[PDB]
Symmetry: C4
């Protein structure tokens, strides 16, 4: 019997071919939709629907109270980070609720201290708890999701993550999750791929997680690796219902941290939660900076405008129709020309 | 049942593998043709044949009256842009007609104002109307094509675009189009691919559109992404009958705009019609610059000379025979060496 | 009959598709393992098990007595290089044995002088002899392995290498090798690939060698091309039992050579054993430098920490379970984003 | 019926997948050969065998009398260029013959003037005539080969080229060629690929030409694209019997032209024979420069040493055995590491 062409005698050792966002484009289709008439609303969880299908990352350089307020007013939601005392995180929930009863979420870990944290957040009025781990395919994480749903599941929605396979998503569904968050490897500040050699390209990870979650009616949150507004449209067409953004929002006025004026240009700090600085395990994230981008309201406007353009080209009046769109796969030669190919740019572009 | 190797259980979710110009080369074949004896004439529309199979883009940094006159004298044609008052566009048609009854086209949009524009252009003597949209697979665009053909189709030829699929090209054929223009995603100044995440690699887009148009006798115009004279030969071998050029002609003396002397080198402005500056929707084009290239007559001479070389290598005495030539697909390692690989260039090359 | 699609009529002329480390990632799986509870021990040879599955390269810029002592104290082993007189190499074995009866290996060549060298190393107390060649698929190399095993095989373990195919690994197994070392082409300082045009991508080379060695109970040493801690996890998941490191350890305090302060940064010399300088045959290696990395103990700590993270993500309590993990294949677009993609790094990262 | 996955309904429109040198490596195999014992002799034509399987390009910056003398003394051969008067080219043949009756070849074109040139070269004692064209798959070129063989074929050997397909090679075999030269697209100074969009990756072109020539006993000359000594071994393993070199020899003392000292480094001119300067048709080559490399004897020594290393790794005692060796295909990730990957080079390497 002949060998597998890439080596050895086991045809399942190399189990899949993984696609990322840069590997695909959306095909145009017959359409009566124009960008202005598209409806961008979508489910965050079984019970919660958002007007704009975007949430901010649970990171100490992205989401505290000011970002959560601005995201909710823009039609999305923020998830407050958990790298601070319980009493301070619960107080940031109250500040958001004092600005109009806006929707808000908050991250928790696994174990006894994370349980005390979760109960204080519920008492403060939080709408969504996010069980927030590097590897959710573990019985202790599944137990945490199920115990929260049993005790406070009537009052608050419970998200679990992160996963990158069909089998991991199915395990969270069986544990009672109200949404499943997908992403191991893809984030802009992630070094899991080179430190551990572990990960999954994000278009294939979404397609596999959706194969388990869609038949059960559980929404999927696509978390990490989104670099352009067009990546949001690709993630939702692969079957996700919302997208979570770190890098794209870390440059805004509302993100925690001060402005950095260096060489006449401006920046703000952005770091992984598994970086040396955030943990103060070998680190699985870096500490860096991103360009300053101005007010959050204007960033969200440009991102939703690109999504609306994609809905016009694909004939999708709603996000549920966009989830049925088709891809064309591209080669390396086709990606290099996608970033403005060979015409000296001179003027600023908003998107 | 096993999953699709790239994810999920649907084998049509990733529907195609899209090739661009850099993915293919033309194979040499048995030939009695030398570059000097090749015949470069080809159909622009059902009724109009050109001596040179090239047209200039309908852009406000590429084609007004001076470019249209020079293109027609060179054996091709210009399409006048529509980012100006109706009375001015109609007057540029008259200026072209006063220089010898040369062929000329002009762009129009969709709706009531575009209808008034179209009727004034016909009264001024235009030969070709181009229904000029970002997404032609839409009933309002198909209605515009059909209504023009019904009212003035005896006097003027009617083009519709742009499309990137077999089904979209078939819909324009059924509506009465005299030619179909192909290109969503590929242009040098296009950002649709990253803003909306939408597009189609241009060799596959041409092959699919031709599968619908050739059996009906409708010519295909390949519009966008052409960077070298060899790309013209590849587009026509994939089945197109003419090519439309923006970047390659924006540097010429006849293009609208003034010369830009900067750092001892010279440039001219070139911008997408969906850029912020041209529209004064989120933008789907950039504003930039290209190197100055001299007179149009000399640029067209070099481009047609490269086409003639391809016809010699493939044994094609006419464009209709070139449309039957074969490709070899190349890998990433083969493209890097195609751009002069590893020999410090010292002297200027015209092409 | 149709041609093979890549040329000619022989479907075995291009025999395989070879994958390297950058072509694959490890898939997360169901896990009760956390990085702290993983067991990193593994067989170096049939009779010798190490606490940490790493050995240092047999190179005159990587391993003399100080590196061998530090590697053994860290739980791994060093292999002393053979580019020095027999009496000096045997004396370095004694120095290692005087620091606590630590484990140590030493390289030898093929022929009569290499036999005298081998006997002196055994008299000095060496634990492992490494028959150390550029191409081990040769009857003289197989004879050397078998004769050593016959004469001193009761006292010392005998390794042979290097190979890159299933048939070559099988020949070393039949000759009596206690471990098989894999790697032709992949090393950071190797130029065999461009000087001779010969080599084998290392993930496929490991998969093929393991197909011969695992059924016989012979461990495989993955030698060359490892650039990050995650590459160690990939090599062991492909079926290797230990990894050998040159570049990653050449920057440490214990490596032979002096520090190089240049432009405020620090370096140390690193060169192939087939470079012009080491041989003083056309050269098949280069002479260069690598950044200074500090003490060996700290480098090994970071490398084993990344391995432990991979064991947590894959649910592997032991190295024998990690050898059963699965890969996802990635495209060129997915690799570019793996190296910290698009976030200006500002702070130092240990790994 | 479903479409072809890359577009259209014709499965032969994209006829082949073309491999270049960077797409493959030679696999090591069982061997009793060491580099010193390999036999590098090989057929140039049916009747002429060389000691070293290399010839110099017929270019006015590579081969006049001094290069032809040095190549023959090194065991190879030179082909004198034809961009000069007939009387001068014939006189350079005599100069070579006055230095010891060394072997020499000379290029000619097609037509009446090329016939007069050919007869004068034969009278001057030339050993090989090379019918030297950009596209040999043409009845006028085949007639020239056949008429030369009929008139002077008893005294001189007749080569024809260049081709890049099985059918073109078969036509030259039927016309009586004593060897077939392969290469359309691959040369370092070639711009046919971007000017005409025409070419064929060189490993696939050799495999296809050999499928026609080997069964007839006609040797194949691999011409263009060779960048390293390892590329020579790959070309011969694909089935060629000799290789022709331009760039690799244009830097030597014996090449025509003067040394260029610029910025403390040294260069020499190198230009295509279809460049603007050589023709004084649109140009299909560039004019440039290459680094100075010293005496030819030393360059040939390093190139043959790399070939000898490949013969050791593959177990090939002769070139006829190397022509039976096997390849592994590599991905883009595997090529980037082949050029010395990540170790600051400090010292000069001869090869
Ligand atoms: C922003 C602008 O981008 C482009 C892109 C390509 C061509 C042109 C253009 C303008 C004039 N001639 N060609 C404009 C634009 C203008 N209107 C409609 C669209 C649009 N519809 C759907 Cl559905 C999706 N997106 C986009
Ligand atoms: C411009 C010039 O380009 C080359 C390319 C490769 C080799 C040479 C060359 C010249 C002399 N020796 N080799 C010239 C050229 C000269 N003539 C004919 C052609 C030609 N025919 C067909 Cl059909 C297509 N294109 C091209
Ligand atoms: C170093 C640190 O890396 C990350 C990576 C991604 C997300 C986060 C994070 C922290 C807080 N929220 N999200 C941390 C970390 C923290 N703990 C556990 C792990 C881990 N477990 C297994 Cl199994 C393997 N590796 C990794
Ligand atoms: C020039 C030199 O290149 C290397 C490459 C890899 C490892 C080493 C090495 C030296 C000492 N330990 N390891 C040397 C060399 C030394 N001898 C033999 C060969 C050789 N044989 C065959 Cl067959 C083909 N080429 C190559
Ligand atoms: O240190 C880390 N390592 C790996 N992933 C991380 C780390 N910190 C945060 N993440 C993930 O990265 C996402 C942000 O990705 P981005 O939007 O591409 O910048 C977050 O929402 C987390 O899922
Ligand atoms: O703003 C824009 N976005 C996208 N495509 C555009 C825009 N403006 C013009 N185009 C297209 O780009 C083509 C020019 O492409 P180029 O020849 O590659 O520069 C035009 O003929 C249009 O089809
Ligand atoms: O000159 C040489 N050419 C090729 N391979 C070499 C040479 N010297 C050492 N090696 C190999 O390269 C390995 C080190 O690879 P690295 O860890 O990628 O730097 C060694 O353990 C040897 O197997
Ligand atoms: O102008 C030209 N265009 C294309 N190919 C050329 C030209 N001049 C020479 N060649 C070819 O290029 C070969 C040299 O290729 P190199 O060794 O890669 O530099 C010659 O032997 C010719 O076959």
């Amino acid at each position: 019997t002949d060998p597998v062409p890439t080596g050895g005698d086991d045809p399942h050792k190399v189990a899949m071919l993984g696609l990322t966002f840069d590997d695909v484009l959306l095909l145009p289709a017959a359409s009566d939709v124009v960008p202005a008439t598209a409806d961008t609303s979508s489910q965050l969880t079984k019970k919660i629907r958002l007007k704009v299908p975007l949430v901010s990352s649970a990171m100490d350089t992205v989401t505290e109270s000011r970002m959560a307020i601005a995201m909710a007013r823009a039609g999305g939601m923020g998830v407050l980070h958990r790298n601070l005392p319980v009493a301070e995180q619960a107080g940031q929930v109250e500040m958001v609720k004092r600005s109009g009863g806006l929707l808000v979420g908050a991250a928790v870990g696994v174990g006894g201290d994370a349980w005390v944290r979760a109960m204080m957040l519920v008492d403060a009025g939080v709408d969504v708890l996010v069980v927030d781990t590097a590897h959710a395919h573990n019985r202790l994480v599944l137990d945490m999701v199920g115990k929260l749903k049993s005790e406070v599941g009537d009052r608050v929605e419970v998200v679990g993550g992160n996963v990158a396979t069909r089998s991991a998503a199915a395990a969270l569904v069986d544990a009672g999750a109200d949404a499943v968050k997908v992403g191991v490897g893809p984030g802009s500040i992630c070094t899991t791929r080179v430190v551990a050699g572990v990960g999954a390209p994000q278009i294939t990870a979404i397609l596999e997680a959706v194969a388990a979650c869609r038949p059960a009616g559980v929404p999927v949150i696509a978390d990490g690796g989104l670099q352009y507004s067009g990546d949001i449209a690709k993630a939702l067409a692969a079957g996700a219902s919302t997208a979570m953004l770190g890098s794209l929002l870390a440059g805004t006025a509302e993100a925690p941290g001060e402005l950095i004026f260096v060489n006449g240009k401006q920046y703000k700090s952005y770091r992984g939660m598994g970086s040396l600085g955030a943990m103060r395990l070998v680190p699985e994230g870096i500490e860096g900076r991103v360009p300053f981008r101005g007010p959050l309201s204007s960033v969200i406007h440009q991102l939703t405008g690109g999504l609306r353009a994609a809905m016009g080209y694909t004939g999708s009046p709603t996000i549920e129709v966009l989830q049925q769109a088709q891809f064309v796969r591209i080669t390396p030669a086709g990606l290099k020309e996608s970033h403005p190919h060979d015409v000296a740019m001179t003027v600023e572009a908003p998107n």
